[PDB]
Structure 1
Amino acid sequence: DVTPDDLWIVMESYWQEKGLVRQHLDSYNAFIERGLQEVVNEFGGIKPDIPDFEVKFGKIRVGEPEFQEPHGQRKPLYPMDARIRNLTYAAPLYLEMIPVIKGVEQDPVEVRIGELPIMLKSKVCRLYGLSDEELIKLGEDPKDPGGYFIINGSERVIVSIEDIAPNRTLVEKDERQEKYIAKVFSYRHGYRALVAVERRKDGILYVDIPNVPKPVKFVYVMRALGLERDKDIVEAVGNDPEVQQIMFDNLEDASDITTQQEALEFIGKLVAPGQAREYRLKRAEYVIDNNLLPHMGVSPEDRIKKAYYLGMMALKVIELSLGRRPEDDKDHYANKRLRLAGDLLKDLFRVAFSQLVKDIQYQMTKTYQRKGDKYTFGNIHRFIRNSIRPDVLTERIEHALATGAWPGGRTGVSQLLDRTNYMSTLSHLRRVTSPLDREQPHFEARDLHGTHWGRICPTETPEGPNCGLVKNLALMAQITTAVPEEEIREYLMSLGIVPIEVRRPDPTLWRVYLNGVLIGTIEDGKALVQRIRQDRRSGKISDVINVAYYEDVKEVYVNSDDGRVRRPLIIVENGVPKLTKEHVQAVKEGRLKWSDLIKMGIIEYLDAEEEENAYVAMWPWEVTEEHTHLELMPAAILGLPASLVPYPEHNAAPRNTYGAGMAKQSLGLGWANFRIRVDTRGHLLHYPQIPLVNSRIMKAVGYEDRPAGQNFVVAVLAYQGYNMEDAIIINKASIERGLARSTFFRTYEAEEKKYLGGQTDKFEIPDPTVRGYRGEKYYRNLDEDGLIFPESKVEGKDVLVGRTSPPRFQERRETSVAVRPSEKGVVDKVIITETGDGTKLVKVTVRDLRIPELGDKFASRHGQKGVIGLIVPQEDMPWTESGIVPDLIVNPHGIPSRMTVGQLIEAIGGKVASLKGRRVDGTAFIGEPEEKLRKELEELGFKHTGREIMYDGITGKRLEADIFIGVIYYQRLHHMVADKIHARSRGPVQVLTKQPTEGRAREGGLRFGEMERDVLVGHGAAMLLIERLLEESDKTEVWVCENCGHIALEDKRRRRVYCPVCGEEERISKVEMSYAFKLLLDELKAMVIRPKLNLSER
């Protein structure tokens, strides 16, 4: 019999082979292989206005990542060069064009339509298939997973969107109008179509179609699709006597329309009101063609299949009206499909290619009209070659990927890649987001559905409004890629199902759906699903095909589409798992791989649909006869950061969530390239350590090669009250010996811009002549070329790169790049590069030492967070009777009401591991039990309770109670007080409001909002309110005439105030006011609003 260790040996091979970012790489590879060709075939060809001239598209291929230098050469490009030079890692797309003249094709001409960004480490990238040494020579970390783009030198990652499954019917309840609605989102060539059939209180079926202003009666639009005879609708809707009765009632209520022409004219009147006779008919036909179920086929021949699908939808609606079937919950992951990188990229490419072909036809038509026929037809090759502008496509792609605003209203599709440490990056690469608006509650959407088990991490989720709408994939997840649909359709047809049009769905027969569209009927659904399962397990067909049957409604569902989330499971046959001991031995020896197990019928992937028919056994010893599958490793249901917490089942859920979220903020050696990388911010921990108590997963996923914390000696007692309310006390001698000591990097960047007209910037030491020339002491360590010396000391407002700009908005503006006003450090490296445009580009990084101090934030993996409350000399710290001096002291009040027994278990385990000389397994559910740790601690000469006797540091006599002390893994967070302190005395001001600026960088002021105003009113301090609001910001003086109240206009020339509107000078008074109020008066007078001011004397 197998044990969880053998299943672990099997499971680790999955990550050993596939990796952790396969959902990006596989989708992008499929896109490159076939999506470009599919889109090109979809567009077809160019149709200009030139007589007897046509262009037919051929094949499209992608070159290698290259860069067009400002100088004529074209050279290979590597990712590090793109990062340093602010380039864009991309490859040119070559498309062949066949010219058709007088219905005759010629020799195709190869043209360059633009450049397409390359996802790193894909099958087309340069880093694919390289060894570790080659990657190191190229300047990259071998542990880097790839799967992200580089746009203008910044790393952009595409987060997967979670959309409703397409071309599927979902029936919902609308109790406000008492309408029972079914909705389908039909997809064809990137266009979406929300088609709904609904039944109101009257029992009449109405159909909603896009671009149709009002719902139309069901049988009206059904007749408009041909199929005019009432018996045809009666048959299509089904063969249930109540259903036939309701359909006949609808027919009686809609006997006005009996001819397809009548219905077409009717929809013409609705969709095109008040227009010509011929226009409305064509508009109605067009709307019917490309707005009613486009996925079924836009060709006018396809009316019959669309009518059949509409009848199926109406049947579902009326069946739910009778309570036969219940409402379908949208959160069920059978109804949700993830939008991977490839799908979104294909949509964007199609959008840009439309503009490209439009520009091509415009340019060709314009050139032919301007010139003569001889000039064009003499050399058609040169004409086509010179009638193309690739920048139209390239700039669209680049800007869409850079800003993140997809064409179609989507925003935030691509986000800047996080690089704080290993966990943060790898977790960002595995994120799933929902398109719903965050402001609304969305109580049902944010909850944890039962189908998320094994597909979505239950703990890792944001804290704020994003709680429940942003989720991360579980460790044992496998997103699918699509397969040729027609081949699956042919195989199913050959299996024995009769086509749909031959016979109607007699309730004695089983409906069969392929990717949500009905395709035929069968008699024995169970035999069919068993046959398909056997073929799938043998290896006859692909492993992406999933089959599920529903006994109650007699339906069979076959899924082969893109974006389903699946998990692996061991197949159980007759109560015996198919994975035997010798298979585990073969996997261990390397003779067998995970893919071989998949192809051998031992392990099969299950999506949310097929899992409906499963009955999974959790543990190997619990397998009984009725079980059909066995769980591989229950500890893998957690996300990547959530696996960091040891003994996570001993903690309260909110604390586990906090710890998982905080594991992405700790400092540490995230990547080996930190020395030569150029990121805006970065941290490095001087002495990282592997956790003593760790889960076995992070050794496999590679975390232990890039640790992000240290092992502290923690004692739990109250000390002087300086550790109260989640504050910690840290030893001083330990800090002075290199504990939690870190370094902070920040990269500044300057560019020698080349303005139009020849006036360019230059790097130099600014002479005192120039305007804006700051103090001489600021440029004190710059070399004569205008660049700072490496390993020099800067302290704030010091110039790093001296640069003077042309006076064009006999002088020279000073535009040097200086350190941030509140920062400090030492210059680490200076890089001189030539940017993409041919000008110069300089990047400087300043490193700063950050010894721990008061206010610095520390946190454990179990959710306990705090700031350093006091630093204590070593001689004042207590010491145990065995000679141990605590590194850090926590408050005993933080343990209860936080309920984190896992922290105490880890505290015991750390000291047990340190005494025993071996690390301790702390896996989620198979880790070392607590009782074993306590017994081992007892065997080593310590108390089983983990408590010890200490002596007080000051008095020197032992404390009355014995104290708990152990070793716990603590992480230093990047919220450090040196980056949060901010002060403002006078500072600069804004332009429009003249209030203090906003932000620490520009010496901004803090915000005194409305709530503070109400607080100050509640205290009853009027003059304090005046002082805080008006006196220190926007003081003003204004003259006003005493009969109109219009703002009197002073005359500096005549030294006399007067009313321009009123012509008054007898009485003008001077009034104090705020600048904001004056601007509000001006803005009211901008409209026709006239505010008349009445003055009074105090």
Structure 2
Amino acid sequence: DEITPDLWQEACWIVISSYFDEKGLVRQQLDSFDEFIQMSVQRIVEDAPPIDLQAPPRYLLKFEQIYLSKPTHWERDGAPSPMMPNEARLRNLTYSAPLYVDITKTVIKEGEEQLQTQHQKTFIGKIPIMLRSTYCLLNGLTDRDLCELNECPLDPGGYFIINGSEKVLIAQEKMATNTVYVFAKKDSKYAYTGECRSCLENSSRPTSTIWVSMLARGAIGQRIVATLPYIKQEVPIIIVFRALGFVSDRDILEHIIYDFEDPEMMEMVKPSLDEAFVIQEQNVALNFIGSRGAKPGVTKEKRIKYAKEVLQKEMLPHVGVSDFCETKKAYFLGYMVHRLLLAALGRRELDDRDHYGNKRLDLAGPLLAFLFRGMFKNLLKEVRIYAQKFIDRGKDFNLELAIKTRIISDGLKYSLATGNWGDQKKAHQARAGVSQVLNRLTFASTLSHLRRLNSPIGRDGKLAKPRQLHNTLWGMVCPAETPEGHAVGLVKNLALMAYISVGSQPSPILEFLEEWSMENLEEISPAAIADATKIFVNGCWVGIHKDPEQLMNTLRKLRRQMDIIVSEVSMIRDIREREIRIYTDAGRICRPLLIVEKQKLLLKKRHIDQLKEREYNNYSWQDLVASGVVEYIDTLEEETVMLAMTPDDLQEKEVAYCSTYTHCEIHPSMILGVCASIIPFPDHNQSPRNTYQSAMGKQAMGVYITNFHVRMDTLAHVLYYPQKPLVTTRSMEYLRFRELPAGINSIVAIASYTGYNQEDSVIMNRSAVDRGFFRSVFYRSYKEQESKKGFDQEEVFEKPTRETCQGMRHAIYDKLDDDGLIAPGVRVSGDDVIIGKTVTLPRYTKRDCSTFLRTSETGIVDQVMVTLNQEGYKFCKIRVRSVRIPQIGDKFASRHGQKGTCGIQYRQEDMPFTCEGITPDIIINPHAIPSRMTIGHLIECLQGKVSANKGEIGDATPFNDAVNVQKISNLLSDYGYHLRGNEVLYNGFTGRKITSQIFIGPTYYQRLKHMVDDKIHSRARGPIQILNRQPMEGRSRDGGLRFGEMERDCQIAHGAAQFLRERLFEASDPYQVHVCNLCGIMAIANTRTHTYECRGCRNKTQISLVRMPYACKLLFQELMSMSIAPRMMSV
């Protein structure tokens, strides 16, 4: 029955494999989008108010149902055919499906003359579709079906195709809503502040933040204030309580202080009462609120109405926005004050801003919902204006012409295309970085980009606290994978078994709590709240309970049985403070864990047995979760959980550590993400090395996707001979690194050989490189289109001619065909022409606008595709193919942060060799190891020697006590090798033995995208910028290198004044001006007629020539634009 330790390493990984058979790696994206389409769009459409318009006749126009068909593309002819994602990629279409809404317009004029007209399936917009979602044409297709459609079966999906560009929505971090968080700002007028970003269940407005603060000590005592929304002045809490109908101080403290035996709380609230005694009735308090507001009505009536509306709608919407909710709002605001007092009295800890239990991940669904709310509101507005301008004339109108569908369509398309998350007009208030271009450089880069999280703290911020690896990231975020540049700690990555909750309605839970012995908050007396336990659901205090323990037992039983409580519902019992917080909302990152009985796992051997035959008896992960054996625990419920790292922790020990565990890790290696799960032996490296590899696995070459032959990507690198690593971890089985690997096993020798590998460089074998070692192919796609925008000027693909075309370069166009497009198989060098495009003029009647190769490439045309774009003019894509043979300067890396460029390449006779004539493919310098402490590199090399000599794949899973260095060495000594991986090598040049026995063996190396040929650049008098006549910027522009301020300072320190003048004047922008010797302002010179005159001074004899930079002339002219007179006085 029990899984014994000897079977555990199989059982756990069997369980893990079942998880990845059920979910995958992009499950969060697909589930978010599916919830958005199934629920969020319908909720948004129904939550909009019916637009009642009347001059008389009236019309309501109620939207009642939505229909999202499959993605479809319509041609000029109008025939209807399904649009496949690959066709969208090739034709630069948007993989979107039409959204139709049912509309009901009832005519009501008078005399009960009512009649309803329903417009079924009114086309309301187009919604882009996430690939492999339920509403994707690739849904449920087999691998054969996907290959029939020219799709990769290993492609995870989880992205959109907007204008042929694959866009991926990055999950955005945000502070959780409807939760009270008591912080303390050191530099502020308030000692403690308790904030609550409140938002109603079905979002319709932004988060309304309410603060309840305490004024810092230094009138008599500490005063509690409340910064309500839409009010620009602090308001005492007692005033707010009275404005809600609680005038008696006893009632207010009944709502705030639940234990009247506690004078400390009492004296700390007393200043607030003493400050609010002149106001003692609800109307006067409402008048005070309205007066403190930023729109103080001259008459107290409208002041009181405004205060009523604010306190009913903007104050704590999550508690309830309807009327008669003042009791719930009063209880909740009293809870906020109670929490603030507990913090000020030291009875509760301040809340941690960085705790991921306090955060939420805004995924594709809830982000598209924000867009859709804004866009549907704008659409209903436009419909209101259109219908108003017609009914004002007293006649009917056609809603089909009122609905301008471009709002929703173009809005979603623009937002996903650019990443600016918001309305196109508010292009600066909008937050960019959402919806990035999917990284297709290697399969690991694609997976990681699809599992990418973002902390929008702002890269400019230099506070390290949000960048720090918090304790609560354990199991939810990769500890290693993070960019090492300016976004350290802000851009994160999901751990492998991390699941972001999609969201759920609290209705069944609330109904069960009602049927259960919970007492509502309006029905109780406050005297009961002392000993009772509060119950919050999605932040709303809904009631109280008397035995929280058996309530938690009941709820956990219900969630483990897949009863009314779904698996993703978090249920935290804080014991010391008697809250029970239940969460069903979306964005809660959680992970699966094995539940533990008294001191035993519930995962018995029968579950492993049924999981082994997963493909026959359809016993899956969901059956494991439904059995009550596995549980999803979120960051906030982990605080109440006692984990076992392994079932070995559940053994009874000579001194028991815990003996009351509640859960167990499925495997600790699941704390790593996609790119860190490729590192072998990451627990033997320094952690920065693991981070650098997690970044560098994403630039590694491989086969980024199986269907690369049909993709017209702008840039693509494919390795000739990708190999799976000889030394692998058990997590790559689910990353599909074995099916799409990104490196080669290289016989690497760590040695000092000729000095060409010093300081992070490598010596490669020229003979190996000749045999296809780390050879790659580079595919570059050029796009072009001939626009017939108007009869004024039209472009067209056609072989240009020297007699008709004007802007025709001296490059030869013979490689083009009569259609103007080069043919595949044609070898093209730099500056060559691949598309001959000519544009009609207003060298006559047509000018050359041909597409050249990006300079200095020298490839062969791989293929040419011609089609029609969305509007329907001819559209061409040409993929050119360039074989990249590794060379000096190309960057290579192992899986341990050990990067370096090729210093030199030696032939096989020049490389050092073992007694059996094995030469290293790569030689790396021993000095790269000691400071870096990448012992995982050495253990991987030794394990790889054992694996190659044994005919297996080494197990480098991080935390594995069945694999240590002594075992690997003992294994290697059985194959006739030195047990530590050393060998006697001979000098290739002289054949003499090397005195020091070299450490050599197979290690998995990666070829990175950074090849020297894509970086080398030179300039000598090339093109210049228009504004300031200085060299351009970039290799692509043939630009010059920037001689910056620091270079100026260095050369000033050198004392090199002529070199400094050469760099900053003569090699950048030499120029001449003519200055009036009297006024010092630039004069008018006419060198052809030799007439120089200053219009200002009315002189034409006292002019002087001045040699100045063009940028300085431009500066002085831009100062004269500002009415400044910079007078260059030559005397």
Structure-2 separation of matches of 1:112 and 1:639: 42
Confirm whether residue 567 of structure 1 aligns to residue 591 of structure 2. yes
2:1070 matched residue in structure 1: 1035
Q: In 2, Cα distance between the equivalents of 1:949 and 1:466?
A: 46
Change in Cα spacing, 1:896 to 1:98, as seen in structure 2 (3 Å) is same
| Secondary structure of 1:182 counterpart | strand
8 Å CA contact 2:230–2:294 kept in 1: the answer is no
- Choose which of 515, 518, 521 in structure 2 pairs with 1:497: 518
- Residue 824 of structure 2 corresponds to residue 790 of structure 1: yes
Question: Aligned partners of 1:1051, 1:232: CA distance in 2, in Å?
Answer: 91
Q: State the Cα deviation string for residues 312-370 of structure 1 (Å, max 9, x = none).
A: 11111112111111111111121111111110011100100011001111111123335
Residue in structure 2 matched with residue 364 of structure 1 by the alignment: 387
Report the alpha carbon displacement of residue 874 of structure 1 after superposing the two structures with TM: 1.8
Q: What does residue 415 of structure 1 align with?
A: 436
- Cα deviation for residue 436 of structure 1 reads 0.3
Aligned counterpart for 1:1010 among listed residues 1036, 1045, 1049? 1045
1:687–1:738 Cα contact (<8 Å) kept: yes
Q: CA deviation at 1:291?
A: 2.3
| Aligned: 1:606 with 2:617 | no
**What is the CA-CA distance between 1:279 and the residue it aligns to?**
4.7
1:848 paired residue number: 882
For the 8 Å contact 1:70–1:836, the answer to whether it is kept is no
Query: Quick check: 1:702 aligned with 2:736?
Result: yes
Q: 1:186 aligns with which of 173, 177, 198?
A: 198
Whole-Å Cα distance in 2 between the matches of residues 273 and 644 of structure 1?
Answer: 60
1:791-833 residue CA offsets vs partner (Å, 9 max, x unmatched): 0111111111101112249532211011012211100101110
Preserved contact between residue 403 and residue 414 of structure 1 (Cα < 8 Å) = yes
Q: How does 1:676-691 map to 2 (within 5 A)?
A: 676-691=710-725
Moved more, 238-247 or 148-157: 238-247
Structure 2 match to 1:1050: 1085
Kindly indicate whether the alpha-carbon contact (under 8 Å) linking 1:644 and 1:694 is maintained by their aligned counterparts in 2. Answer: yes
**Over residues 897-920 of structure 1, what are the superposed CA-to-partner deviations in whole Å (9 max), with x where a residue is unaligned?**
111111111111112111112222
Deviates more, 1:836-845 or 1:1028-1037: 1028-1037
Aligned-partner SS, 1:46? coil
Task: Report the secondary structure of 2:1050's partner residue.
Answer: helix
Q: Return 221-230 or 748-757, whichever deviates more.
A: 221-230
Matched, 1:216 2:235: yes
Does residue 760 of structure 1 match 2:794?
Answer: yes
Is the 2:765–2:905 contact (alpha carbons within 8 Å) kept by the matching residues of 1?
Answer: yes
Equivalent in the alignment of 1:1075: 1110
Kindly state the Cα deviation for residue 725 of structure 1 after the two structures are TM-superposed.
1.1
CA distance in 2, matches of 1:951, 1:75: 68
- Name 1:268's counterpart in structure 2: 290
Alpha-carbon distance, 1:961 to partner: 2.8
Task: Name the SS of the counterpart of 1:869 in structure 2.
Answer: strand
Mapped partners of 2:1067, 2:990: distance in 1: 53
Shift of 1:992: 0.9
The correspondence for 1:979, drawn from 981, 991, 1014, is 1014
- Alpha-carbon separation, structure 2, partners of 1:841 and 1:126: 25
- Report what 1:207 is aligned to: 226
**2:170 maps to which residue?**
159
* Letter in structure 1 aligned against 2:22: E
Tell which deviates more after alignment, 85-94 or 710-719: 710-719
Q: TM-score, normalised by structure 1?
A: 0.97
Structure 2 SS opposite 1:672? coil
* SS, match of residue 445 in structure 1: coil
1:457-536 equivalence runs, <5 A: 457-501=478-522, 502-504=524-526, 506-536=529-559
SS in 1 for 2:683: helix
Instruction: Please give the per-residue CA displacement for 1:984-1030, whole angstroms capped at 9, x wherever unaligned.
Output: 11111111111111111111111111000000100001111111111
Worse-matched range after superposition: 1047-1056 or 60-69: 1047-1056
Distance in 2, Cα, partners of 1:596 & 1:1090: 82
Structure 2 CA distance, aligned partners of 1:1032 and 1:878?
48
What are the within-5 Å matches in structure 2 for residues 884-1033 of structure 1? 884-926=918-960, 928-1033=963-1068
Q: Any idea what SS the aligned residue of 2:480 has?
A: coil
Give, in whole Å, the separation in 1 of the partners of 2:9 and 2:952. Answer: 21
Amino acid across the alignment from 1:135: L
1:84-123 mapped onto 2 (5 Å cutoff): 84-102=90-108, 104-110=114-120, 111-123=122-134
Residue 272 of structure 1 and its aligned partner are, at CA, apart by 4.5
SS in 2 for 1:519: strand
Amino acid at match of 1:23: Q
Per the alignment, residue 751 of structure 1 pairs with: 785
Q: CA RMSD in A?
A: 1.8
Tell me if the contact between 1:195 and 1:208 (Cα under 8 Å) persists in the aligned partners.
yes
Superposition deviation, residue 963 in structure 1: 2.1
The amino acid across from 2:443 in the alignment is Y
Q: Does structure 2 conserve the Cα–Cα contact (< 8 Å) formed by 1:4 and 1:620?
A: no
Q: Name the CA distance, whole Å, in 1 between partners of 2:816 and 2:325.
A: 75
Q: Which amino acid aligns with 1:965?
A: I
2 CA distance for matches of 1:887 and 1:244? 78
SS of equivalent residue, structure 1 residue 354: helix
Q: Work out whether residues 767 and 773 of structure 1, in 8 Å CA contact, stay in contact via their aligned partners in 2.
A: no
Q: 1:937 to 1:510 in 2, by over 3 A?
A: same
- TM-score, scaled relative to structure 2: 0.94
* Structure 1 residue 1066 displacement after superposition: 4.3
> Matched residue of 1:88: which SS?
coil
- Structure 2 unmatched ranges of 5 or more: 423-428, 653-658
Q: Tell me which amino acid in the other structure corresponds to 2:376.
A: F
The counterpart of 2:411, out of the listed 382, 388, 396, is: 396
Name which of 656, 665, 674 aligns with 2:708.
674
Is contact 1:920-1:928 (8 Å) kept? no
Change beyond 3 A, Cα 1:568–1:97: same
Q: 1:870 to 1:1038 in 2, by over 3 A?
A: same
CA distance in 1 between counterparts of 2:734 and 2:1127 reads: 76
**CA distance in 1: counterparts of 2:492 and 2:71, whole angstroms:** 33
Instruction: Answer with 165-174 or 934-943: which moved more.
Output: 934-943
From 11, 18, 22, give the equivalent of 1:13: 18
Cα deviation for residue 1088 of structure 1 reads 2.7
Q: 1:1039 to 1:549 in 2, by over 3 A?
A: same
SS in 1 for 2:631: strand
Find the aligned partners of 1:608 and 1:361 in 2 and give their Cα distance.
45
Query: What do the CA deviations read for 1:819-852 (whole angstroms, capped 9, x no partner)?
Result: 0122111001011101110101000011001111
Counterparts of 1:767-782 in structure 2 under 5 Å? 767-770=801-804, 772-775=806-809, 777-782=811-816
Q: CA deviation at 1:1053?
A: 9.4
User: In the alignment, does 2:836 pair up with 1:802?
Assistant: yes
C-alpha distance in structure 2 between counterparts of 1:808 and 1:295, whole Å = 63
For the residue of structure 2 that corresponds to 1:112, the secondary structure is: strand
Give 1:308's match in structure 2, choosing from 321, 331, 335. 331
Structure 1: gaps of 5 or more residues: none
Q: Distance in 2 between matches of 1:566 and 1:116?
A: 29
Contact 1:272 1:280 in 2 (8 A): no
CA displacement, residues 508-564 of structure 1 (integer Å, 9 cap, x when unaligned) = 211111112211112221121122112222332322222222222222111221111
CA distances 1:104-158 after superposition (whole Å, capped 9, x unpaired): 4513112111111111111111110111111111110111111100001000000
Distance in structure 2 (CA, Å) of the matches to 1:620 and 1:838: 63
2:34 aligned with 1:29: yes
Deviation string 1:757-808 (CA, Å, 9 cap, x unpaired) is: 3642111121113454434542021111111021011111111110111224
Which amino acid counterpart does residue 238 of structure 2 have in structure 1?
V
Percent identity, aligned pairs only, is 42
- Among candidates 292, 313, 318, match of residue 315 of structure 2: 292
Q: 2:53 aligns with which of 44, 48, 52?
A: 48
Tell me if 1:593 matches 2:605.
no
Give 1:131's aligned residue.
142
Separation in 1 of the partners of 2:323 and 2:1093?
77
